[PDB]
Write a protein that binds this DNA or RNA. Structure first.
Length: 49
DNA sequence: TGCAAAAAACGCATATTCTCTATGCAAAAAACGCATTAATACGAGAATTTTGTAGCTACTTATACAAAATTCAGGAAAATTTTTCTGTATAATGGGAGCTGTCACGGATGCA
């Protein structure tokens, strides 16, 4: 699932997330700009392929 | 249902008399004295005699040297267990495991 998600000013954000009954988390997001990256068991890479 | 009143009983005249209060008799206890005998205790004699005191004597022990006949503490082997070290030869070629929902604060850096 997926964070609605909000900010320091108001203008808001979007971000996504995935986790089964057991395993990693597929997590997604929005740098203001209909962008993405993919973060999983890393929390170290604004990486989006 | 008021008594006046009669006869027999129930009350003022003595015999009887009979429990009754009253002294001399008498018989055996008792206790006192004549007293007698025996026994409870004083007198003398010399006999046992135990206790109290001295010296001798036998037992008991105070003490001075020490290796008795026995105990023990190390010392140095084994005895067996155990410990540390060294060694055994086909190929084998990048590691899993949660962190992802806390709120707020204080610097400390990075990033244009």
């Amino acid at each position: 699932y997926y964070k609605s998600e909000i900010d320091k000013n108001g203008r808001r954000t979007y971000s996504a997330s995935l986790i089964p009954n057991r395993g990693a988390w597929l997590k997604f997001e929005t740098d203001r700009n209909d962008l993405v990256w993919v973060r999983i068991d890393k929390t170290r890479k604004l990486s989006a392929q």
